[PDB]
Every structure is written in C-alpha cells, then in structure tokens.
Amino acid sequence: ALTQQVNRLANIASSSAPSLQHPTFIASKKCRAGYTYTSLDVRPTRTEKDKSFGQRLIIPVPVSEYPKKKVSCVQVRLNPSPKFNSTIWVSLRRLDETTLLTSENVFKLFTDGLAVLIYQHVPTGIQPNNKITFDMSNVGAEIGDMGKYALIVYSKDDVLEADEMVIHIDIEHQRIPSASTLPV
Amino acid sequence: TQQVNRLANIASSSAPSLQHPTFIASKKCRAGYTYTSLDVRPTRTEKDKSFGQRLIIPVPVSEYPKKKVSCVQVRLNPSPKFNSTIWVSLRRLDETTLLTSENVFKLFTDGLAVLIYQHVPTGIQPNNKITFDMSNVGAEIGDMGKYALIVYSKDDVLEADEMVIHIDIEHQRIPSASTLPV
Amino acid sequence: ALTQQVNRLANIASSSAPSLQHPTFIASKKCRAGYTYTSLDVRPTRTEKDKSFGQRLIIPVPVSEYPKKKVSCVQVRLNPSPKFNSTIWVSLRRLDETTLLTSENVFKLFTDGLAVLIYQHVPTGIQPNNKITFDMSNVGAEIGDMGKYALIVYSKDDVLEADEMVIHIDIEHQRIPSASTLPV
Amino acid sequence: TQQVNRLANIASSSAPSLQHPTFIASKKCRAGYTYTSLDVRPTRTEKDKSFGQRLIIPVPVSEYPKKKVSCVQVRLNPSPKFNSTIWVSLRRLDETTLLTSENVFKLFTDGLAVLIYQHVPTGIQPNNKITFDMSNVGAEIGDMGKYALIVYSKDDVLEADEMVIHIDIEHQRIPSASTLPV
Amino acid sequence: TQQVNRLANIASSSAPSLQHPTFIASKKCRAGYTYTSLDVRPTRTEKDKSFGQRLIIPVPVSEYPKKKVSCVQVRLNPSPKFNSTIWVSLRRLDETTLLTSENVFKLFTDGLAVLIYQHVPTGIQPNNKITFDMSNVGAEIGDMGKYALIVYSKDDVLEADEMVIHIDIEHQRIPSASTLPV
Amino acid sequence: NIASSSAPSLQHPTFIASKKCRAGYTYTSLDVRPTRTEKDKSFGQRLIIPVPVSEYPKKKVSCVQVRLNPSPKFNSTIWVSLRRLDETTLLTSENVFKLFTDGLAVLIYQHVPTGIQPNNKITFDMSNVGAEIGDMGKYALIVYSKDDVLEADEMVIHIDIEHQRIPSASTLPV
Amino acid sequence: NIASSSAPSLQHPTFIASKKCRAGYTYTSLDVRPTRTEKDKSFGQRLIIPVPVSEYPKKKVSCVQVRLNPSPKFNSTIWVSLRRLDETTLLTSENVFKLFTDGLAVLIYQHVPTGIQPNNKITFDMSNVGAEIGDMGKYALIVYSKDDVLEADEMVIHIDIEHQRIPSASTLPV
Amino acid sequence: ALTQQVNRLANIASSSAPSLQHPTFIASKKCRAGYTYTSLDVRPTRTEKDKSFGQRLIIPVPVSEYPKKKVSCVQVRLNPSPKFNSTIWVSLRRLDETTLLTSENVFKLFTDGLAVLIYQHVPTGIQPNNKITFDMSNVGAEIGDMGKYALIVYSKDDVLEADEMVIHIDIEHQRIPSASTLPV
Amino acid sequence: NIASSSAPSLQHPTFIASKKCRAGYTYTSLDVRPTRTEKDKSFGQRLIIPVPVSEYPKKKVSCVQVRLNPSPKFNSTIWVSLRRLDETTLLTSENVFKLFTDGLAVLIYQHVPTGIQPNNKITFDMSNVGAEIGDMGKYALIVYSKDDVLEADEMVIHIDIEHQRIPSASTLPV
Ligand SMILES: [Mg+2]
Ligand SMILES: [Mg+2]
Ligand SMILES: [Mg+2]
C-alpha cells in the first residue's frame, strides 16, 4: 500500500471545512512536536489612523531563564472585541531599537521578502483567517533571541482603539527542564 | 483504509442534509453516555448589554453529582422575530465576577471558543451549535453549576421572543436503578 | 545478589552528611515521581509574640483550573532573612473558615495526632532542619481540596516581623495536561 | 500511484496556507538553481500612463553572464496606499521601441502572458505573482538586460508609494569560488 | 557493587583529611573540562551593608565566549583578621537592579542556594566553598558577565583585609591552539 | 590518498595572492569609503552585515580578509586592523594604541617610492573564537592616519567574509 | 599517481617567472605602444583579437597575462589594469578611480633606484566568468600616468592570451 | 570478590577513632613507599603577636649531598610544650629570599590556592589535628629544591614564646644510596 | 603515511606568519613595556614566569618567540635579543656588544619609509639546551636603542613560551 497521498488528501479535505464547534476563527496545528509553547497577551494602544503600533517580544519570567532554548514557529491568533471596527495590517521581524516605526519606515519592510497578515472587519460575521505563523526552524532562534523580534500593526482606516482588540502570540519551542525533586 | 473513511466522514459534514433548514451538522462526543438538554429563554437584553445564565442542572440528574461530563453543546433555535446578532460562550465562574459588559469582553478575548450568531436575510445563519469539552478539566455533574452561559447583543435590543437556546450535556448514563421509588 | 539493604545503607549514609554545596539547609527528595510540583510564596505579616499567623492554600491560576488533580505530599521550605531573630512553631491542616486561630485554638490542634515543625534561630550558623513535608497519598487530596487546607505559625518569643522570613511551600501532584497544538 | 500524488499537489495549491495574507502560492522552477530578487519602486505613474524598467542585473551576478536563466517570477508586495489597478508583464526589447501607451497595448494583446492587479476591498487580490520561462528561448544572464518589465495604471494615478515589486530570477548556481577575492 | 563504592565515596567526604585546616572537601563537576579561578578582595563593607562583584572573565579566556560553563565554585580563604559573619551567593543580573540591602534579601530568600560564613573561635568554619550549576540553564563564557557574586556583612563592619574569595569556573578546555601568536 | 587531498597550496612573494578557509563556504564582501579623518585621528566602522545574510546570525564564520584598493590620490600612511567590543569603548588616540599593541594582529599601509607597495590584504581567523554572523556586528574595523589626514576619497576598502553557505534557497519567494 | 600528476609547480621571488592555465591550450600575444598620454590622463586600448583567431568568437579563454617591457626612457610611474564594459563608459580620471578601487585586480609600475623593479607581469582569470574569444573585444586594458606624462615610446606592452587550441587546420587553404 | 571498597571502608572507619595508645595527636601514613624520610627540628623564636616567624628548609649534611633526590610529600608534626598558650596559623611555600614576611605579605599568600594549618590551644585537652602535609609528587621536587621552600607561622593572639613549642617537619623522598663496602 | 603526517608546513615572505614547536604543548605570553631607556643605553628584563606556571619549574620548554607590537609613536631604531646568565653580569654598552656578536641569535627593528617594516617576531629554541620553566628566570631579554632614546611608550613586547601542558587540573580548588 502507498500512504503518502492519503494523508495529504485527508488533511487538505479537512482544514477546508466549516464543520462544527468554532466561530469564524481559522484552524491551527503544531510545529516540531516534543515541543511545548507559550502564549503572550497584547492589548494594543489606541493607535491612530495610518498609525502603527508595535511591541517587542518580552518572554516570561519562568522561560526567559533558559535562553538558548530553540524556537520553531510563532503563531499569532487575534481575538477581536465586538468593538473591533477598523481593519489592519500586521506582521513581525527582528530589530535593534535604533529603528522607529515611522509610518514610512513600516511600509518599507512590510513590502519585501516576508509574511504579513491583513485583518478586516467584515459585516458577514467576521474575517475567518485570523491567525498567522512564522518559522524559525532555519533562522535558528533561541529564547533569548525573541527579545530582538517584535510584532507590529498598522491601522489602515479606523483609528483602532485599545478596546478594539487583543492579540495572543503563541511560541513553539523546546520543552523546558522538568524538576523531579522538591526545593532547597 | 482509514484515510478513505476519514475523507467520507468529512465530506458528509459538508453537504446540505434533508433534515436541516440551515442548522449545520452536530456529531456527539461519547458512547455509553447519554445527554440532557436545557431550555433558555433569554430575558430581553438591551443593545451592547449582555445576558447570562448559570448552569442549573435539573431535578432528576442533579442527584448523581458524581457523574462526569464530557462535553456540552449549545444549539440555539431562533424565533422568526430573531433580528439581532450576538456573541455567546461560557466558562467557570465566581458569582461575584459580574457580567459587566467590560468584564465580558475581557474573557471573550483570550484562550477560549466563542460563537457569533447574526441574522442574515438569505435564509438564516447555519452553524447554530457549538460544543465545549470537560474531559481533561475533569467535570462532574455538580461542577456544572460553577459554569454559566453568556450572551452579548451587539446590535438590536435583543428581544425575549427573539430566540431560545438548548444546552446539551454529554455525561455518564445514570444507573437503570431498576427498583420503583420509595 | 540481594539489593534491598544496599540502597537503604547508601541513602542513610548520605542524607546524614555535611558534604559540599549547601548552607545550613537540610535535604529533600521527591514523592510519587511522574509528578510535577508547584511552589508558593508566603511572606508573613508582622505577627506579635504569642501570636499566630496563617494563610490558606491558594492554588495558582494555571493549575487551579484542574481540581481533581491528586496531591501526594506538600513540603515547606523556609528561607529566613538575616533579620530572622525569633523562633517559631509551624504546621498545617484542613479547615472551614469558621474556625479562628485564637492562640488558644492553635495549641489545641498543634498538640495531637499530627506533624509540626519548630524553627529556632541559633547563633551557631542557623538551624539546619528547615523544611517539613506532609503526605496526602492516603487522605486523598485533589487540587481543589488544597484551598481547604492552610499553613500556620506561632511566634513563641520574638514578635516576628514580615522581614524576618519568607516561606515557600512546594506541592507534589500529577502532571497537568500538556497541549501539543497551538491556540484558537 | 503518480496520479494520486498529482491530485495531492494540486489540492495543496488550492487551500489558504498559514503564511499568506492573500498572496497565492508560488512554486519554483528548478533544482540546482538559485535565484536572485530585485526591488522596483515604480515612479508615480499617471492614469492611462505606463511605467517600465529594464532588467538591470546586480553587481555580483552581472559578472557571470554565461549563466543561464530558467524562469523569472514577479511578486509584488503592495503598500496599504495601493489604490490603483494595473496590468503588468515583460518581454524582449529594442530600447527605441517606446512605452507609448499605444505601443504597449499592441503587445499586451497577442501571444503572451500578462498579470492584472486590482485593488479590492474584501482583503486584497491574491495571485500577486506571475512567472515567465526562458528555458526554450535560451536565456543567458547577460540576456536579461534585453528584457524589461512593464506596468499600466488603468485607473488611479498610481502613486510611487502605492507599491513595490520583487523580481525573482531562477538560474544556475554561481561557482562556490572558494578563494577570497583579489 | 555500585552501592558499596557509593558508601566509600560518602564516607571519604566525611573525614578530616591531611590537607585542610577546616576547609571542607570540594569535588569537581566535569571531565575534559578545565577551570579558572578569580580573586576578590572585597571593599570594606559596613555592617548590614552588602558588597557585590560582577563576573569579569579574564583576558585570555574572555576570548572564547562560545565555550560552555558547567558549574562555578566559590572558595573563600579568610584572613586571620576575618572577624565578621556574612551571607553570600550569586545570580543573573540586570545592572540596574541595585544591591540595596532590601533588594538583596528579596532574592536571598527564594528558590536558590546561599552560603553563610561565621567566624567561630574553636578553629574556623569548615565548608568555605559552595558551587552552582549552569549545565541546564546553558551557560556560555560570555554569559558569565551577566551573573555576579554578592555578600552581606551581618555583623562586624567587614574589613577589606578580613578576607579574599576565589571563584572557580568549570568549562570546556580551550583549543591547544598549537601555533605561536601573531 | 590523504597526501593528494591535502596537496592544495600555492602562493609567492607579491601583491597578488590569496587562498580561502574551508570549502563549501561562500563569502561576502563589504564596501567602506572612510571619512576625511584627521591626522592622528582614527576612523572606524562596525561590521554591518548585509540584508540577505544578516538573517542567520547563527551561521558560522571562518575568516575575514580585508583587501583595500586605494585611490591614486591616497598619500597618507596609516595603520589599520579590527576587533570585537562594546560600543562603549571609544577610539581616542590613546585607546587605539592600547589594542594595537596587543597579542592581536594589525597592518600598516604607507605609500613610498620603493619598488612595489605592501600587500593590501590581511586576514583574520574565527575558526576557534567561534564567530556567528550575528557576532560580526560586535566587531568593527579601525584606522589611524599617522601622517597626512586621509580623505574619504584617498581609499576604499573591501572586507571579505568566509562563512557557511546560506540556505539552498530551495523555492521561489513570497 | 594523482600526486605525481599534480606535482607541477615552480617559481621564486624575482622578475623572471610565469606558469600557464590548463594544457592543450595555446595562447596569443598582442602589441601595444601607448600614447603620449598626459599626466593624470589615462590611456586605454580595446581587446583587438587578431585576424586568424578572431574567427572563432566561440572559443574559450582561460587567462590573460599582461607583461610589459618598458623602454630605458620609461620614467613615469603608472597604474594599469583592465576589465569589460560598454564603449559608452569613458575613461575620465574620476571614472578610472571608481573601478580601480573595486573587488577587481590592478598593477602599479614605477621606476625607482631600489634593487630591482616590480614584476611587469600580471595575469587575469576567465576560467569562471567564462570568456569566449569574441568576448575579448568587450574587455580593454587601461593605464593612468600618475606622474610624468608617459610618451608613446616610454613603453610597449605584450598581452598573452591562454585559450583553446584553434582548428587543427587539417588541409591546405582555398 | 570485589575488594576496592572494603579497603576504603576499613581505612575510613579507622583513621576516625580515639582507639588506644596516643595523646590528642592525629594520625599519619606514608607517601610513595620504597622511600625513606628525614625529620627536622624547629624551635621558633619568641615571635610577637600578629608577628610571623619562618625558617628556610635546611637539608642535613648527609642527604644534602644528593640533590636531585625526589621528594613526595612533607609532613609537619608539631609537639607543643605545656607552655603553648597561643594559637597560630602555619603553612609553607617556595621562595626567593627577596621576599620578606611583612605581616601584610604573609596574609597575601596565606589566602589563595594553597594549604594552611591552624593550631589553637584548647582547654579540653589539646587540639588533636596537629599535623599537615604537602605533596610534591607533581611539582617535582628534588632535594636541592627544598632550600627554596620554607615554612611559616603567624601568632594570631598571644605573643608566642620559643618555649611555647617545637616543630618537626618530616620529608618523604627516595632512599639514598647504601654503601656496602668499607671506606678509603 | 609518514609522508602525510610530516606534511605540515605553511609560510610566505610577509609580516604575518608563525608556526609552533611540538603539539600537546601549550604556551604562555608575557607583557613588557620597556623603559625610557636612553640612546646607546640598553634596557633588559628577566624572565618573570607567571604565577600559575611558575609552580612547575621542572616542566620543559621548547621555544620562545618574541613578537613586539610597537606604538605608532615608536620612532627609534633598536637591536634586541636575549640569553641566560647570572644577575652578576651587567648591561654596560660594552658588555652588550660582546654577546650581540656571538654564535647566538638577534633582531633589529628600525622604522623606515620603505614598503613594509621587518618582522617583529623572532623565536629561540630550547629543545636541545633543555630548558625547564624554572630555568627561564636565568634568561632575560635585552634591547639597545642605537638612535633616538626610545620611551616606555614607544613599544610593548609579548613573549610567547612553548612548553608542556601543565597538570590536567583534574579537580576543583582548595
Ligand atoms: Mg549560541
Ligand atoms: Mg471527587
Ligand atoms: Mg634537573
């Protein structure tokens, strides 16, 4: 028997179905299994129209303690509030504080070799495809590295409000060491 | 030959069936399990105002609290007067925590599933059901009370007659208890 | 060969040695392995002399979500501050808020079927045996159950200050389910 | 079992992937080949006016002209200010031949591929890429200069910041040349 | 027969050896690894005041930052003038975070090892060493700088001549680099 | 045939010769017009890895040669080298010397009427220090005009970087 | 015997030594008296392949050395090299420097009272750029008289061209 | 049978016992056997308080004649007189007369990579551990070399007197050639 | 494969090249700022073995190179070398010459406007004299400022010492 096409057909048939148990929120999978991940909360600030907002990657206190911990991918789901009226562009890349997101600056990178997600408010429910992910399997990303990165957003039409939405960014990486013996 | 059957199952979910107006499919989550539905006529709820109801198990089940729950579906048969469009979900609760609009959003927007039901003109919204799993969390019948369903009328001042919700509860069959009462 | 005494002799020889790498802090092991634990921080309040202080068990936000999660034991290490001048009695049991630690009330239980740790400040370094543990393997303790419990302390001589010390209470329990697939 | 894999490949191209906003797939045309992209900020171009750029290979490749080219993709990342709608393509050229609107159409309309990019409101146009093959024609790196990309702003007076194009070039890997310069 | 040898090892650690005044044993944490010590004459530090020093790797090692560290022992040879009694340890740092007495305690008291050295009259305190492991955390030579050793003079106004500390660093041997400089 | 395999080697006393460290490695050059930096005044530039590589800070670097093609106008005589560091350290004449006179490399290029002029190439090894692409930024080349104040046009330097070939770039872009 | 086969190699620090790229290859020289080109003024000549070769523009070129026998009168000091291009580009002093200071070769030949004078030979490789005989025309050598204005008689250059042997010339002509 | 632990357990049990036949004088063994040793007498001088006394290694007339004779270790037993009232620090290292034991100088070395013995007068008999030894197996020490070395002492509290004590320093080294034929 | 084993060797006429004696050997460098020693006046420094090595005077030494990184200010021209001796002997100009002109080594480093400057490195062999670490002290390097009086800042010397790797340093300290 040849099972190298069955899987493909099965998974392609799936992912593309408005089955049961779920809002207008797309699907999601997992990177190099044998990995665990960590999510992050990011309520934006009332960012003007044509204005861009961004946040650096600020690892959490318990993981941040293991830089050199490899990252595979990094998904970004965004649960919007009912008050999400605007429509915006969003993505994320490496840095050096040195650079500032002058509207002009942002476009620059937005437009070139790299991924970017658009989230528009549709009055026919709400834009399904609400998450996007990035792969570090190759660039080679250690946990410390994260800080260098940072996600962005650009409010194309409405002056997005802080109450308009909240983003969760999930991070696939190697399991951190599990202690099997009580403290000092 | 498990790949092929898997595709046959998926194709079935995706095809208008001769038993629904627009109400999408709804497979159950357990064998050897029975369920129990609930009726929920929501109080007329203002625009931007939210309505919620605790999980008040009924009289005959409420008595075997040690029984576990797998999942809990929420089908919502709307009345023709259903004009508004709303967001709905449910989670663990602490009474105190109040359904203040602001509070609501808070949770709505984070790790957890939520259903939106809009009144469309070309027939009516399909997926009118949504399910939640308690397997992992480990949920006993008594536990239910802790949880509670919510609703947010995003537009029209949702009317009382605008709709009715049914909450289905998968759990362990209750002992046949073959022995007439008292 | 008979290896049912070797282990015992080896572990008894060990635990009782002022070897290397460690202050006047006793040792520690692990309960039903295949379990993970969780620690808790408890800076006390300036508790008078002859007065007792106590804290209920307030599980954390990520675990508290899985009551019905069995607990094996519960250790209580106490890293004291240099300013730890007093000497105190400490332990922990089940409850019902209904009861209040009237000095008198405390003694009552302190004295009967149950464990209790004394921590005195010695001027010959500091009291080694600084931790104590309790077993729930049998009483059967689920995570929800914890809240019912609560640790206590009684300042026998000095009016213990909040800066005098801080306690960490570690909890052996079953590993919580690990998600292997990114969010909504 | 080559028919089955063929359908699996086709099904894959046709399914939103978790790495694109609306930018359709884009398979490459060669192994043992590497490519090289180019950036093209088009000058603000009037309505009904057309803009074009010759193929100016870069400094480090431009030096191994004997290297052959397979195909050349043209992805175009538009800015949010991208409001216009335009037609674009490219072919062999004779400098003299001038991008006079009229001339343009002439070729546009005949044996050859062309891409149209319109600004839609429901998100944004998908297929933002298009590729051309030089295998047959036989195209050397030097040859590129001969060719040139074009654009026609059918509606808005296409702005400079309205967008940026990237031209990908599949060709033979360049000799590792393991030996530090001069 | 691994149990028996284990007891022989343990018994050895626990027996005055003919090479120490009162300085307890001190086994190393790695093979194929070499270490490097450091000298630390602490500035005279008030009573209740704390002193600290960052990990300033030296000139010849500081150059192979990619080299990993296993553990780091801290032996402290006190002078006869050593009269005070102090607490000492070390951890990751953020410069800013200041050795304000209060800050110190904060960490001292939590998940982490700390050594106390008191001046006794019947000879002198034994265990004068303590070690920390970086295996798990994953520590490169460069990383060291991040960390820093601390001290708290609990009693006497610890004098400069009161003592000297040596910090031993287990890490990967440096390449023989058999090839005279420049 | 380990003898035949190692055989590689070729060079002669002249200003025209240069090998390379490890095969399967590719390199990358850099351009550096200096500044009209004064006499006695030193000029320096950080390692600004370019746009397509700068994306795998984890890739390894073997060597890094620095050839310098001068302009016919180049007249001054200057010392030049490079090392790692923290932006914190500043190229004060005094600071410069400090390092210059260290157990670590350095070239001098002066123009004089004597047969031919010095090699313009010099190279540094990272095969041991262990240098990843990201690491480069930390390093930075320097120069000290011992005599005439060189002008931004008295010369142009090219810095070549041996390192691991970057991703096969398997399939077409975005 | 791959070791014996590769064995070939021989040269020493002096103005008398030169090998060759690939065997089975023959070469062709060229003569180039310059022009009384001014001081600061640059002189250049295109690659005028000769009459019998110029007929197989498809033949491959390996290297191209450029030895230059100067006259005893040669006094000036000059820079010299060569590259490809489009007739369009013009040897303005400024343009010259531009390339001179590129990731691509160059020699300087000055006359001074110091032991012996620089090598007059320099060579360039085409084994990779891939150069066909026709291609030559595109290239062209240059020179810049940094000092004294050299005269058309201050020197004569010979340019040797390694390439594939031309047709066996099997049978007698027309 | 496995006899690689028996010996260890036996010798560890021993050395740590107040058996029979011996004052409050610790024990002692032997270095590379097949070696003989040589002792030295060192009555100190009335060395002030906070003052340090030292003596170079002055090999004896019959051995001193065979420099290049390797030394393994060097023990230093110190039989104190009843009048030993003070308490002192003692050790020993290489030299070059050039250096002088300024109290300050002494500390310097005392505190660093190297052994050091403290001998205090206790009124509960007398400080058992009265000897210390140093190993040259590795540094490689020839008999001539000794002279370079020299032992020291620092009277921490009482102004040690010459009558307060006397030290014997024993030297393990290779047997010197034994003549088996009468003289000239 | 004794041929392949011996194969090791690589160097070219320039101020950038240095091998090493025997493997399994490690070395140790030393720093030596001189003194503002007069013109004609010689300066010297004994071999002050450092603190961690100085403890195995019985360890063997192979070679001992002496590279000298000068400061840009270095102007004087000087002779330099080193040998064993008894503190008794004193560096009087006359005494200096005596040895300088012996069957035993020596370098001269002057600064001049001529292409590049001499190698700064020189090395000495002990593989036969038999030198133990302790022995070093007996030796000592010297210098003679033939012209300008060099200043303690006109230069800094590094002396590298090939010798047997010291004790594996098996287990953690005291
Ligand atoms: Mg790393
Ligand atoms: Mg239960
Ligand atoms: Mg000897």
I70 → chain F, closest CA residue? F101
Neighbouring subunits of E (3+ Cβ pairs under 8 A): A, C, F, H, I
Residue keyed to tokens 């590729």: D131
Q: How many CA atoms lie within 13 A of A85 on its CB side?
A: 12
Select from 1.10.1760.20, 2.60.120.530, 2.120.10.30, 2.60.120.590 the CATH code of G1-174.
2.60.120.530
Q: F with C: 3 or more CB pairs under 8 Å?
A: no
Contact A19 B25 (CB under 8 A): yes
Compute the distance between CA of residue D45 and CA of residue D43 in angstroms, rounded to an integer.
Answer: 6
d(CA A47, CA G135) in angstroms, rounded, equals 59
Here the tokens at position A102 are 């002058």
At a CB cut-off of 8 Å and minimum separation 6, what does A169 contact? A39, A40, A42, A57, A74, A75, A76, A77, A151
Residue E157 touches chain C, beta carbons under 8 Å: no
Question: Could you tell me the distance, in angstroms and rounded to a whole number, from the CA of residue B66 to the centre of ligand 2?
Answer: 7
For residues E153 and E60, the answer to whether their CB atoms sit within 8 Å is: no
Please give, rounded to a whole number of angstroms, the shortest distance from the CA of E150 to a CA of chain H: 19
Which ligand is nearest the CA of C67, by number?
Answer: 2
Q: Do F69 and G106 touch (CB under 8 A)?
A: yes
Of the candidates H87, D8, I77, the one whose C-alpha atom is nearest the C-alpha of residue A7 is: D8
What are the CA-CA distances from residue H92 to residues D23, H46, H79 (Å)? 79, 19, 18
Nearest to F16 by CA among A101, G104, I147: G104
Q: Identity (one letter) of the amino acid at B96? A: T
Ligand sitting nearest the alpha carbon of F130: 1
Q: Return the closest-CA partner of residue H50 out of H25, H4, H12, H87.
A: H87
The answer to whether the CB atoms of I167 and H113 lie below 8 A apart is no
Instruction: For D2, list phi and psi in degrees, rounded to 5.
Output: -90, -25
Q: What residue ranges do the domains of chain H occupy? A: 1-184
Of the bound ligands, which one is closest to the alpha carbon of residue I134? 3
The amino acid occupying position F168 is: S
Rounded to whole angstroms, the Cα distance separating E169 from H43 reads 41
* Nearest CB to I113; choose among F101, F110, F115: F110
Provide, for chain E, the percentages of residues in helix, strand and coil under a 3-state DSSP scheme, each rounded to the nearest 5. 15, 25, 60
Put simply, the answer to whether A65 touches E113 (Cβ < 8 Å) is no
- Do E and H touch, counting CB pairs below 8 Å (3 needed)? yes
Q: How far is the CA of H148 from the centre of ligand 3 (A)?
A: 14
Cβ-in-10-Å burial (0-12, 13-18, 19+) of G27 comes to middle
Determine whether the interchain pair A107/D161 forms a contact, defined as Cβ–Cβ distance below 8 Å. yes
Q: Tell me how close the Cα of F93 comes to any Cα of chain I, in angstroms.
A: 10
- Dist CA I58 CA H142 (whole Å): 10
Q: Which two tokens stand for residue F129?
A: 């220090």
The CA–CA distances, whole Å, from I142 to B28, I151, I152 equal 94, 15, 14
Strand partners, G105: none
Residue C77 CA to ligand 2 centre (angstroms): 29
**Residue B149, amino acid:** L
Q: Contact at 8 Å (CB) between B84 and B119? A: yes
**Contact E34/I at CB under 8 A:** yes
Q: Which residues of E124-161 are buried (b: 16+ CB within 10 A; e: fewer)?
A: bbebbbbbbebeebbbbbebbebbbbbbbbbebebbeb
Q: What angle do CA D37, D41, D45 make, to 5 degrees?
A: 140
A neighbours by CB contacts (3+ pairs under 8 Å): B, C, D, E, F
Q: What are the b/e assignments for H125-158, b being 16+ CB within 10 Å?
A: ebbebbbbbbbbeebebbbebbebbbbbbbbbee
Contact E181 F103 (CB under 8 A): yes
Residue of C164, C157, C165 whose CA lies nearest to C48: C157
What the block records as the tokens of H80 is 């104190």
Is some CB atom of chain A closer than 8 A to the CB atom of B11?
Answer: yes
The interaxial angle of helices C6-15 and E2-13, nearest 10 deg, is 20
Interface check H137 vs I, CB under 8 A: no
- Please state, as a whole number, how many other Cβ atoms lie within 10 Å of the Cβ of residue G168: 6
User: What is the CA(F126)–ligand 1 centre distance, in A?
Assistant: 15
Q: End-to-end distance of chain C based on CA atoms, in angstroms?
A: 57
Residues of A in contact with D163 (CB under 8 A): 111
Do chains E and D touch, with touching meaning 3 or more CB–CB pairs less than 8 Å apart?
no
- Do residues D47 and D157 lie in contact, with contact meaning Cβ atoms separated by under 8 Å? yes
Rounded CA-CA distance F151/F155 in Å is 8
- Please answer whether residues H74 and H172 qualify as being in contact, where contact means their C-beta atoms are separated by less than 8 angstroms: yes
Tell me the CA–centroid distance for residue E59 and ligand 1, in Å. Answer: 21
In order, the DSSP letters of F26-71 are: E----EE------SS-EEEEE----TTTTT-TTSEEEEEEEEEEEP
Left, alpha or beta for I40 (phi > 0: left; psi -120 to 50: alpha)?
A: left
Task: Please give the resolution of this entry in Å, rounded to 1 decimal.
Answer: 3.4
Asked whether the beta carbons of residue E180 and residue I26 sit closer than 8 angstroms, the reply is no
Chain D to chain F, count of Cβ pairs less than 8 Å apart? Answer: 71
C-alpha closest to that of E174 among E72, E26, E74, E59: E59
- Degrees to nearest 5, angle at CA E45 with E41 and E49: 135
- C-alpha angle D67/D72/D77, rounded to 5°? 135
Cα–Cα distances in angstroms (integers) from residue G66 to residues F94, G97, H72, H131, I3, in the given order? 46, 20, 73, 84, 39
Rounded-to-integer distance, Cα B171 and Cα C9, Å: 52
Ligand nearest to the CA of A68: 1
CA atoms within 13 A on the CB side of E94: 4
Q: Give which of F14, F101, F123, F146 to mutate to test I binding, by max I Cβ within 10 Å.
A: F101
Distance from residue H137's CA to the centre of ligand 3 (Å) = 15
Query: Is there a contact between C73 and C133 (Cβ–Cβ < 8 Å)?
Result: yes
Cβ distance A170 to C180 less than 8 Å, yes or no, reads no
Closest by alpha carbon to C3, among D21, G155, I133, E6? E6
Nearest to C61 by CA among B65, B94, B109: B94
Report how many helices (DSSP H) and strands (DSSP E) chain C contains, helices first.
Answer: 3, 10
Q: What is the CATH class of H1-184?
A: mainly beta
Judge whether C83 is closer than 8 Å to chain E, CB to CB: yes
Distance A39 CA to ligand 1 centre (A): 24
Experimental method: X-ray
Chain E partners of H131 at a C-beta cutoff of 8 Å?
18
**Total CB pairs under 8 A between chain A and E:** 14
In the chain, the amino acid numbered G129 is V
- Name the CATH code of domain D1-182 (choices 1.25.60.10, 2.60.120.530, 3.40.50.720, 3.40.50.150): 2.60.120.530
- Chain center to CA of F120: 10
Taken in order A156, A162, A165, A168, the sign of the CA dihedral is positive
Q: What angle do CA C114, C120, C121 make, to 5 degrees?
A: 160
- The HSE-up count of residue A53 (CA atoms within 13 Å, CB side) is 18
* Alpha-carbon dihedral E70, E76, E77, E82, rounded to 10 degrees: 180
Our CA-based measurement puts residue C58 at a distance from the nearest CA of chain B, in whole angstroms, of 15
For residue C34, give every residue at least 6 positions away whose Cβ sits within 8 Å of its Cβ, in sequence order, or none. C174, C175
d(CA E133, CA E69): 8
Chains E and I touch (3+ CB pairs under 8 A): yes
Hey, is H11 helix, strand or coil?
A: helix
Among the listed residues I162, I152, I158, I150, the one whose alpha carbon sits nearest the alpha carbon of residue I68: I158
Q: Is E97 on the interface with A (CB under 8 A)?
A: no
Q: Of D66, D175, D181, which has the smallest distance from its Cβ to G103's Cβ? A: D181
| B65 touches C: beta carbon within 8 Å | no
Q: What ligand is nearest to the CA atom of residue H145?
A: 3
Is residue D101 within 8 Å of D47, Cβ to Cβ?
Answer: no
Mapped to the 3 state alphabet, what secondary structure does C63-131 carry?
CCCCCCCEEEEEEEEEEECCCCCCCEEEEEECCCCCCCCCHHHHHHHHCCCCCCEEECCCCCCCCCCCE
Q: Note the Cα F43 to chain centre separation in Å.
A: 14
Question: From CA I81, how far away is CA I123, in angstroms rounded?
Answer: 10
> Subunits that touch chain I (at least 3 Cβ pairs < 8 angstroms)?
E, F, H
Reading the block at residue H42, the tokens are 């060192």
How far is H178 from chain E, CA to nearest CA, in Å? 31
| Residue B124 neighbours by CB under 8 Å, 6+ apart | B21, B22, B78
Token pair recorded at residue C55: 């804290």
| Residue D71 exposed, middle or buried by CB count within 10 Å (0-12, 13-18, 19+) | buried
Long-range interactions of A102-109: CB distance < 8 A, separation 24+: A103/A50, A103/A51, A103/A52, A103/A154, A106/A52, A106/A152, A106/A154, A107/D79, A107/D80, A107/D81, A107/D161
Provide the b/e sequence for C127-145 (b: ≥16 CB within 10 Å): beebbbbbebeeeebbbeb
Contacts of E37 in chain I (CB under 8 A): 173
Q: How far apart are CA F57 and CA F163, in angstroms?
A: 11
Residue I18 near chain F (CB below 8 Å) = no
Strand partners, F79: F108, F144
Q: Which of E166, E126, E123 is nearest to E16 (CA)?
A: E126
Choose the closest CB to D180 out of F69, F160, F165: F160
Q: Is D102 in CB contact (< 8 Å) with chain A?
A: no
Flag whether residue G66 sits within 8 Å of chain F, measured between CB atoms. Answer: no
User: Is B148:B93 a contact under the CB 8 Å cutoff?
Assistant: yes
Number of other residues whose CB lies within 10 A of the CB of residue B96: 5
Does F103 sit within 8 Å of E182, measured CB to CB?
A: yes
Ligand closest in space to the Cα of C145 = 2
What is the separation of C-alpha H113 from the centre of its chain, rounded to a whole number of angstroms?
A: 18
